[PDB]
């Protein structure tokens, strides 16, 4: 978790006896983490850039009626 | 490379004889790297609307 933010000390690499695959696995972990976070980022930005969508706010009217 | 994730410590900028221009050349490095990394992601992982949901699902059948 600390390495995901950018505060992780690379000390577990020497912990394992097999660093050649461990480093590759770790690097894939950060690559996938960034891919997932940025996919979420574009998801939010595309959802919020339109403001009012055709399918959107029909949901909102639905929950408003349901709550009433 | 560690600067891209931020793990590595940035004590190297204290050794340059011209910190005024090294910092400028490093800020543009970070911006260029971030843009160049974001572009491939938005080009590959992103991608008409239901084309994928139709074709990729029909492939499984």
Swiss-Prot record, chain B:
Domain of life of the source: Eukaryota
Transmembrane segment boundaries: 21-47
Motif Selectivity filter, residue numbers: 6-9
Extracellular side: 13-20
Tissue expression from the record: Found in the synoviocytes from patients with (RA) and without (CTR) rheumatoid arthritis (at protein level).
Membrane-embedded but not crossing: residue ranges: 1-12
Subcellular locations according to the entry: Cell membrane; Apical cell membrane; Cell junction, Adherens junction; Cell projection, Cilium
Reported modifications of this chain: N-glycosylated.
Residues bound to Ca(2+): 9
Disease linkage: Brachyolmia 3: A form of brachyolmia, a clinically and genetically heterogeneous skeletal dysplasia primarily affecting the spine and characterized by a short trunk, short stature, and platyspondyly. BCYM3 is an autosomal dominant form with severe scoliosis with or without kyphosis, and flattened irregular cervical vertebrae. Spondylometaphyseal dysplasia Kozlowski type: A form of spondylometaphyseal dysplasia, a group of short stature disorders distinguished by abnormalities in the vertebrae and the metaphyses of the tubular bones. It is characterized by postnatal dwarfism, significant scoliosis and mild metaphyseal abnormalities in the pelvis. The vertebrae exhibit platyspondyly and overfaced pedicles.
Assembly: Homotetramer. Self-associates in an isoform-specific manner. Isoform 1 and isoform 5 can oligomerize, but isoform 2, isoform 4 and isoform 6 cannot oligomerize. Interacts with calmodulin. Interacts with Map7 and Src family Tyr protein kinases LYN, SRC, FYN, HCK, LCK and YES. Interacts with CTNNB1. The TRPV4 and CTNNB1 complex can interact with CDH1. Interacts with PACSIN1, PACSIN2 and PACSIN3 (via SH3 domain). Part of a complex containing MLC1, AQP4, HEPACAM and ATP1B1. Interacts with ITPR3.
Job of this protein: Non-selective calcium permeant cation channel involved in osmotic sensitivity and mechanosensitivity. Activation by exposure to hypotonicity within the physiological range exhibits an outward rectification. Also activated by heat, low pH, citrate and phorbol esters. Increase of intracellular Ca(2+) potentiates currents. Channel activity seems to be regulated by a calmodulin-dependent mechanism with a negative feedback mechanism. Promotes cell-cell junction formation in skin keratinocytes and plays an important role in the formation and/or maintenance of functional intercellular barriers. (Microbial infection) Facilitates hepatitis C virus (HCV) replication, possibly through its action on DDX3X.
Similarity remark: Belongs to the transient receptor (TC 1.A.4) family. TrpV subfamily. TRPV4 sub-subfamily.
Domain notes: The ANK repeat region mediates interaction with Ca(2+)-calmodulin and ATP binding. The ANK repeat region mediates interaction with phosphatidylinositol-4,5-bisphosphate and related phosphatidylinositides.
UniProt-recorded name of the protein: Transient receptor potential cation channel subfamily V member 4
Taxonomic source organism: Homo sapiens (Human)
């Amino acid at each position: 978790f600390k390495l995901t933010i950018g505060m992780g000390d690379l000390e577990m690499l020497s912990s394992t006896k097999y660093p050649v695959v461990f480093i590759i696995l770790l690097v894939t972990y950060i690559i996938l983490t960034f891919v997932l976070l940025l996919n979420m980022l574009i998801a939010l930005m595309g959802e919020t850039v339109g403001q009012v969508s055709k399918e959107s706010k029909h949901i909102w009217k639905l929950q408003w009626a349901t709550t009433i």
